[PDB]
Every structure is written in C-alpha cells, then in structure tokens.
Design a protein around this ligand. Sequence first.
Ligand SMILES: CCCCCCCCCCCCCCCC(=O)OC[C@@H](COP(=O)(O)O[C@@H]1[C@H](O)[C@H](O)[C@@H](OP(=O)(O)O)[C@H](OP(=O)(O)O)[C@H]1O)OC(=O)CCCCCCCCCCCCCCC
Ligand SMILES: CCCCCCCC(=O)OC[C@H](COP(=O)(O)O[C@@H]1[C@H](O)[C@H](O)[C@@H](OP(=O)(O)O)[C@H](OP(=O)(O)O)[C@H]1O)OC(=O)CCCCCCC
Lengths: 50, 782, 50
Amino acid sequence: GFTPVSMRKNETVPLFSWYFPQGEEMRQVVVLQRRVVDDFLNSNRVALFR
Amino acid sequence: KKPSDYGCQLHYKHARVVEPESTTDDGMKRLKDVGDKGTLITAAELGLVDKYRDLKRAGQDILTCDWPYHYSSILYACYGNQYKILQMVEREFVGSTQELTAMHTTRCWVGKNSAMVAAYQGHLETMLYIIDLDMQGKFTEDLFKQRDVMGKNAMMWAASQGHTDTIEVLLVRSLYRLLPEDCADPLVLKTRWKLVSLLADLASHCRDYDPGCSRSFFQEVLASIKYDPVEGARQEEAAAAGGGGSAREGAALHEPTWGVDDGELKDVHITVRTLQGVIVSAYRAGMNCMGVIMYCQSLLQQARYFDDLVAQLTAWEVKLLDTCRNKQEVQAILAPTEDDPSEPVGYALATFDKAFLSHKFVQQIFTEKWDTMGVTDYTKSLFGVVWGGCSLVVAFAAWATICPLVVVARSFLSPVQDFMMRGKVIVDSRFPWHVPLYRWLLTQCALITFTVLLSYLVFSFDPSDPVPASVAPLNTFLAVWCAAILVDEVQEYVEEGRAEYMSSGWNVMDVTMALSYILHYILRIIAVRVTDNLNILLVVNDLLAAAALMAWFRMVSVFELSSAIGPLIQMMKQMLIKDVTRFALLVLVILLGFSVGMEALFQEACIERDPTTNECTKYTSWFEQKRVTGVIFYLIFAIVTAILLLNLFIAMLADTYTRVSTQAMVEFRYRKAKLMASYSRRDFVCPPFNLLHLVCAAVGNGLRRLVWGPDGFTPVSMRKNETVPLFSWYFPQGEEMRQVVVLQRRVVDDFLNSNRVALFREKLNAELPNLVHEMLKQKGKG
Amino acid sequence: DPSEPVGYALATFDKAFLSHKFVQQIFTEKWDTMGVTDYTKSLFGVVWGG
Ligand SMILES: CCCCCCCCCCCCCCCC(=O)OC[C@@H](COP(=O)(O)O[C@@H]1[C@H](O)[C@H](O)[C@@H](OP(=O)(O)O)[C@H](OP(=O)(O)O)[C@H]1O)OC(=O)CCCCCCCCCCCCCCC
Ligand SMILES: CCCCCCCC(=O)OC[C@H](COP(=O)(O)O[C@@H]1[C@H](O)[C@H](O)[C@@H](OP(=O)(O)O)[C@H](OP(=O)(O)O)[C@H]1O)OC(=O)CCCCCCC
C-alpha cells in the first residue's frame, strides 16, 4: 500500500478535517445541528405568518 | 432502487476508511503532527491539562520557547484555543498579577501576544477568556492596544483574516469600555448590563477545566454592575407612562415590542438599537455626543464586515449636524469645555473624515476664521478684481524689503517681537500678518516667482560661457532656495507627523523639485572642470528637465480654493492614487506581451547556404504564400491588443465617472478644510526666508539666555504653534460655558428624540400587521 | 447522513452560498491560517515575505 498515487487532486481525503465525526463528537454535532435548524424553521414560520 | 435521487446528487462520493480514534476538537486533532514529547509547549498545544500540571509540578518551566518562532508555552495555549490550561495557570501557579501580565504579553518573533495570537485565528472560546480578564482587571497592561511589528493589533488581525465571530466580541468590549465605570445612573447601568450579558450569553458553552460550579465566564463581571433587570424593567414602564420622566420624552430607550406571534438572549448580533443605547447613554454620562458618533464609526471601519452600521453612523453624524440651525449651535456641540476636553473637529481632521468636513456648517467655521474680511468675495465683481489684483503686486513688493528685515529684527529687537504679537484676537486688516488668507497669498506669490525664475534660467542659458556659468548669481540663488525648501519639509515631517505629511500630495513635489535642482546644481559643477564627459552631462540636462516639470505641476496649487478648478485638482489626484497603480500593472503586461510577440514574428531566417552560412533572408524591422501567413498573425495580434487596451480604457472612464459624479464637491471641500486648518497653525514665513531666521533663532534665542536669562516671548524655531487652540471659541471660561451647555442640551436632545421616533417608524412599517393583530387578539383573551 | 453540501455547491457553482462570511471563514482557516496574505500591506511584510 501507501503508493504515491498517480493523480493530483487527491480523493482519499475529505476536504476538511471537521468532516465525518466518529464518536461522542457525533452526539454533540447532532445536538448542535438541531438547535440551529429548529431556530431557523420557526423564523420562517413567523415570516410566513406575516 | 437502493439509491435515491437526493442520494446520487448530494452524498459524499468516494469510499473512505474510518480511523480508529480520531478526534475533531481543536487540540488533540493534532497529536500525529505536533507530537507528544512532553515538554509543556506540546502539552499546551495538545490541551493535555494533566501533562501540563505534572510536567510543571515536578519540572520544566512555564515560558520556554521554540527557536524560529519565539512562541511561549502560553502562546501555544491560545494557538489552538486551549483556555483550559490558561485558566489552570491563572487560578494556580501564578500570583502577583504583574506576573500574570508578563506571562501573556511576553512577545513573539513577529510581535504577537496572547490576545493577538488568539485573534488572527477565530478562537472565541479563548478570546472570550482574555476579554474576561480585562473586565475583572487582571492585566495591568491593556493588552489590546499593543502592536506587533507590522502595525497590526488584536482587532486588525481578526478583521483582515475575516473572523466575523471574533470581531463582534472584540467590538462589544470596546463599546463597553466607552461607558464610564462608576456612574449612578439607572440607564447607563442598563446598557452596561445589556452588553456584558451580550458576551456572557455568547460564551455560555465554556465549562471550567474540572467539575467546579460552572463559573460560566462572566459571573464576576455581571455581579459588579448593580442593576436589577426586573426592577429597572418597570422604572421605564412608569416613566414612559404619560410622556416621559427621564426628561428625554419617554425613558429614551423604551418602545413597544407589543409582542409578535408564531402562528401557522436572542439579540446576539450588534443591532442599531445596540449602538444608540451607547450614544444616548454616553451622552447621559457627560460625554460629547458628536465625539461618540465619530468614535463608534472609527471602531466599525476597522472591523470591515459592518457596512450597514457605518452607513447608519455616518447618517447620524450628518443628521446631528443638520439639527444644528445657526452658527451658535454648531460651535456649541463641537467645542471642548473644561469638563470634557474632547474636540471632534481636530479628530475628524486626523482620521480624514470626508462626510463631516464637507458639510456646509463645518465649511463655515473654517472660512469665518480664515477669511474674516470678505476679500475672497471681492473677486466676483467688476470693480473688485481690478483693485484686488493691484493690492497683490504692491504688497508683494512690500513683502520684499520689510520681510527680510523683520525676520532679522525679531531675533535681536524685543520691541518688534511684541509688535508682531498684536493678533491672536478678532484679527483684521490692520495687521495682515495674522489673518490666514494673506499668509496663503504670500505663499503662492513666492511660488509663481519660483517657476518664473526657474523657467527663465532654462531660456536665458547661454552655452558659450566659461566655468562661472556654473556659479552664477541667479544659478546659486535658486540653489539656496531649494536648499531651504528641503529644511522646511523636514520641519513639517517631524512636527505634523507622517500620516498627515503623506496626505497632501504637494509635499512630495516640494521635495522632488528641490532635490533634483540641488543635484543639478552639484553635478553641473563637477561635469564642467573635473570630469568633462557626455555620460554624466546628459544626466545634468535630465535633472533640470525633471525639476522644471515639477515646478509647473506645483503651480496648479493656486486653483485649490477656486470652485470649478478645485475639483479638477482632486479628480486628477485621486485618479493617480486609486486607479493608475492598478491599470499600469496591466498595461505593462499587455505591452510586454505584445512586444515579445512582434520580435517573434519579425525574426530573420537563413535559407541560402549550400556548404555553411552563405546568406540569410531579410525580414522587416524589429509566390509561395510566405509573407501572407505571418501578416495574418500580425493582424490578429494587433487587433486583439488594441481591443484589449480599449476595454481597459472604458474601465478607467467608468471608474473616474463614478467618483466625479458622486463625490467631487466632497473631495474639493475636504481639501479646503484641510487647507484652512494648516494655515491656522502656521507663521507667516515662506520657504526662502525661514532659513534666514533658522540661523538667527539659533543665535537670537541664545543671547537672551547667557546674560538676561528668562526673557520670554523668544522666537520659537518650531513651526505649528502648539500652545493656542484651533479656534478661538474652544474653551469658554464663564458665562459662555453656562450658555454653551444650555445650547448643546437643546440641540442634541432633539437629535436623540428624532432618532428614537425614526427607528420606531421602521419597526412599525415592517411589523404593521402584527399591531393590528394584537388589537384583535384581545377579543380572543379579554 | 453522508451528504456534504460544500462539495455540492462548488460543483453546481452556487455563488450566493459559496461567498458568505461563514463559508469564506471555513476555507480561510485551511488555505491561510497564518495570515501570509496580509504581509503585503506593510513595508516589513514585503521585505521579509519577499
Ligand atoms: C507615469 C506617471 C504619470 C503621472 C501623470 C501626471 C499628470 C500630472 C497632472 C497634473 C498633476 C495635478 C495633480 C497632482 C497632485 C498630486 O498630489 O500628485 C499626486 C502624487 C501621488 O502621490 P501622493 O503624493 O498624492 O501620496 C499619496 C496621498 O498622500 C494619498 O492621499 C495617500 O493615501 P491616504 O489618503 O490614506 O493618506 C497615499 O498613501 P496610501 O498608500 O495609503 O494610498 C499616498 O501615497 O503623484 C505625484 O506627485 C506625481 C505626479 C506628477 C509627476 C511629476 C514627477 C515626474 C518627474 C519625472 C520627469 C521625467 C524626466 C526624466 C527624463 C529627463
Ligand atoms: C487677485 C486675487 C485677490 C483675492 C484673492 C482671492 C483668493 C481666492 O481664493 O480666489 C481664488 C481665485 C478665485 O476663485 P474663488 O476663490 O473666488 O472661488 C469662489 C470662492 O471660493 C467663494 O467663496 C465660493 O463661494 P462659497 O465659499 O462656497 O460660499 C465660490 O463659489 P460660489 O458659491 O460663488 O459658486 C467660488 O467661485 O481663483 C484663481 O483664479 C486663482 C488666483 C489666485 C491668486 C494667487 C496670487 C496671484
């Protein structure tokens, strides 16, 4: 393995290091996402009421 | 059937391998890279609280450093936002808060400190920790005004790098330190509490380093303000119950918020209602209200991502200055009293304020003081241009025999210096040395004189003339002149500084035509009897050509005060600042690209040789279809270049159009305000005659100190008289001070009311169907 | 959910998303975490960076 791969623009890298978060960082993202999206979905539900 | 349509289009493409134990917190994502060598500089970068403690409790140091970059152990802790160990050290392993400072302000190799290395990376959870320590007063250093060795500071790093989440935090603590610490006022204590809870509810996810009891971040700071947020919630409901008992027509920060519905704390960002909770409250603490609006605008213009708030604070600065109705009220909101010695005029000059100095009431306080006789307005009549022009030629003849004598006499005669001090008053035409327009006219009449004598020198140059053509009387008088111009620029480089010096555009041309002719005067002498060659002779004729242009480009300076030619000096200056240095770097690429291609076409070849190198066919300058193939590339290269320059000339016609059309009187009137304020703080001397007293003041000041001693009113060699203020109405002393206070309360309490109404109207526009729905919801409940 | 939205936006050329303050901030802390792009606005930066 670990051959110098014959391509530029490497594929065996997610672009950022904060991608797929295994462990108890998944449980803290999923809480922190649901805080953000639930506070977004009821500022549309206010602005569609006006 | 197993993939969806969303799945083919949006999921992660490739197949990865799950790492066994890979964290994604800020430290400990970097264990494979930094290492785990156990050295307190790795234990802080990684965030190992236990290995920082045990390596210190038994061991090493606290402030060792790397070689190339001089980062401490502390400076890795906030490089990777490990506030857990910075808080460990501050709670234990430090005492004597001068040791807490010097551990944070240590330095780096570029010049960072602990709050600049946590600022050029967006590290909220740590930038909220150093900001926590200032409000508690742990630092005796104010570790946010320090500069690295690039000019930057804590907030110029987070603004250039673009960390908007941190710029908001660095700006709330700067809106907080404005409002005074110890003040008994139930409404500066509201807006100090509304801003520290803006930070405390913004960290609020920043547990301590241990169990503890949550400490959240700002417990010791919100508990030092003494504001009950529910008792003060009804101080305003009862004061704004019948029109206003805060004396500002309401409680002055109180509106509806009737209540909005959903159907079918949370103000975290800095709103406009946040910035007028500061301007109202800073005015109710004693401060200048124009000063806070200029100060809050200078904050948000180095924040760089706040352009809906700079547009509002520039609109309130011009709205305050139109509430002012006569000159008596304009100079009563701008005057520094004895209580708050804060001028907002001289601070608008120092930060290059266009929208303030262009205003019609601010152009009036300058021209009242700079003209005071009306002799500008004598050039709009039939019988005034004739008589006004005659007084120039007579007085400039009079400013040729008494000006070098009074310059010498003020050195050695004490009666004549007290005669030359009969100004600093209502100053009029009796003593024309002290009215600031006339000192501008003797500057320009000594400047048209310089380019006539210089252009007479290049015309009345006789070539068949011996070596006294070098040292002539006229050739060496112009060299003494340009000697004394260079000494006058070093005076106004040290006095008025560097940001002011390189903000005029004529101070460069005063040096460069003086430095060229004084180098022309030397190299002509050397090339006429020492070394007589045409290599350096053609440099001598090249400096005098360069020094004769910059004489005549300097003579468009008389038109700076004229309307209709004044804005052509400014739309030509701004064109050479903004536009030319980005279009000349592309014309240089296009023309060098076109020039190498023409050499590559018009390139000779050799077809005639049987043995070795008989002949070569000649091609022009730089059958057989042979001259046609190259000329169809000569036509493609010339067309696609000339179209490419014309595309770039439309880009310059349309950049200068947008500045001419919008902002031409603003640039013109800004320069008049910058020109009327230089000549206010200046004497009456000219470039040829300051050196005439810079030798006499080196003698005439000393002769009164060896035998007399404390003489007084000695001629200062420093220009820009710094004792006297800018205007004569600055500091009142008595009944003028009691009247100005009555006029500024009258003006700015009706500035601040008509912003409270005009903000609420935009709240009632966008939320109008919710007020009507609350009037019908009462049928629902009661 | 293995769905990345950053890689989909720069595949479909999404100029309103892809130039926000918060998206230009997550690219900058990988592209340039040191601020070398601002060693041009100073005399010390051009000499020592150059
Ligand atoms: C190739 C160049 C072509 C130029 C064409 C010149 C056409 C002349 C038209 C008539 C001239 C009238 C207008 C000139 C008035 C003038 O002030 O000159 C402009 C200045 C531009 O700089 P600035 O002073 O305004 O200095 C700025 C300014 O102070 C900003 O305000 C600052 O920003 P700030 O506001 O924040 O402080 C800038 O700092 P920053 O880096 O931050 O931007 C600072 O650099 O240009 C000139 O003086 C030169 C113009 C005439 C050239 C005369 C010298 C040429 C002599 C060579 C002859 C060749 C002979 C050799 C062979 C014999
Ligand atoms: C002979 C001059 C004697 C008096 C000196 C006068 C000193 C001086 O500043 O005039 C410059 C002169 C005339 O221009 P000038 O200054 O008078 O321009 C008017 C002047 O600015 C008024 O004050 C303006 O009204 P305001 O302020 O907005 O209310 C007016 O605008 P508007 O509202 O009317 O439309 C302007 O038109 O321009 C030259 O040709 C250069 C000769 C310089 C001479 C250099 C030495 C030879």
